Amino acid sequence: TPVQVMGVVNVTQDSFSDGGKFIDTDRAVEHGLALVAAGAQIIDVGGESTRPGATRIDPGVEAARVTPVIRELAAQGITISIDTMHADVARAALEAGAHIVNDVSGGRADPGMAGVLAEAKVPWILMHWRSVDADHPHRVPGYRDVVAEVRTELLAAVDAAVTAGVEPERLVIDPGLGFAKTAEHNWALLHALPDLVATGVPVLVGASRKRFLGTLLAAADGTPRPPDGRETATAVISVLAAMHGAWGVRVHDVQASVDALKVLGAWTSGEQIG
Numbered sequence: 047t048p049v050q051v052m053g054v055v056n057v058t059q060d061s062f063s064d065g066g067k068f069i070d071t072d073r074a075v076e077h078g079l080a081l082v083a084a085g086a087q088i089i090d091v092g093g094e095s096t097r098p099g100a101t102r103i104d105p106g107v108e109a110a111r112v113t114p115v116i117r118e119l120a121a122q123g124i125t126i127s128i129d130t131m132h133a134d135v136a137r138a139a140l141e142a143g144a145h146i147v148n149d150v151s152g153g154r155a156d157p158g159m160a161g162v163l164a165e166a167k168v169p170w171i172l173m174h175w176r177s178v179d180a181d182h183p184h185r186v187p188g189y190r191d192v193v194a195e196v197r198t199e200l201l202a203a204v205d206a207a208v209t210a211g212v213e214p215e216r217l218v219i220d221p222g223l224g225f226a227k228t229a230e231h232n233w234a235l236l237h238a239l240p241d242l243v244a245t246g247v248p249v250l251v252g253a254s255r256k257r258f259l260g261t262l263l264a265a266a267d268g269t270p271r272p273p274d275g276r277e278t279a280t281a282v283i284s285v286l287a288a289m290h291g292a293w294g295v296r297v298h299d300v301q302a303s304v305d306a307l308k309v310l311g312a313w314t315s316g317e318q319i320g
């Protein structure tokens with residue numbers, strides 16, 4: 047039972063991050079093909095961003111961006127997750143060939159998401175993000191115990207999914223590192239990863255390039271490490287997550303995490319025989 051490496055393809059970021067004017071399906075498809083060639087088991091396709099100050103787009107535009115990419119990658123037999131909070135977008139992505147729904151709201155953004163998943167009978171990833179104030183969706187709340195509360199709320203989301211008719215075997219949970227959480231919250235959640243794995247629900251970890259790695263690796267004068275300088279740290283997290291029973295890791299740099307997991311595998315089996 048090896049850890050699943052989930053490589054990220056965001057069609058909007060691929061098309062626009064370096065200044066491009068037009069949506070570029072072919073670039074995103076070639077990106078996904080390259081991540082598969084580098085060892086990804088799952089390609090997570092997204093059309094939106096949730097970070098502060100992102101460009102905001104209609105769900106119709108979100109779907110129009112992801113579905114051509116999903117259609118071409120699915121035609122190559124690739125396993126594809128759709129990274130969306132919007133039920134209508136998830137449904138369109140499933141029509142296009144996605145086989146997993148990755149919901150950073152954990153079903154809380156769209157009351158129709160549970161019904162989409164219950165009907166489609168595909169896996170549903172429920173990420174933890176406590177976001178009571180839509181005017182401040184990233185504000186860090188007061189946790190008495192972030193470890194216990196994340197677990198409680200993820201399992202409550204699992205319960206609501208099952209009540210809606212999703213089969214328990216099809217749920218995945220994700221602690222949502224960095225989403226209304228401090229760096230210290232993240233490290234407590236990661237140290238407690240075995241506890242969350244012990245729920246029996248598959249656990250996905252997404253640490254790749256997140257702000258707490260910029261903080262961890264800050265320069266002597268306080269300047270955080272830029273996102274490109276966070277990849278060694280991200281790959282080490284993939285290894286420690288794998289060692290502690292994570293079902294999957296969500297990463298941008300698939301090659302670096304695959305390299306790291308090959309080291310873990312070669313070390314572990316180094317004295318085996320026969």
Ligand SMILES: Nc1nc2ncc(COP(=O)(O)O)nc2c(=O)[nH]1
Pocket residue numbers: 054129148149150171173220222223250251252253254255296
């Ligand atoms: N399940 C899951 N999905 C996610 N989707 C987007 C982002 C935002 O980060 P990005 O812009 O680097 O993709 N992070 C996660 C995460 O940690 N877990």
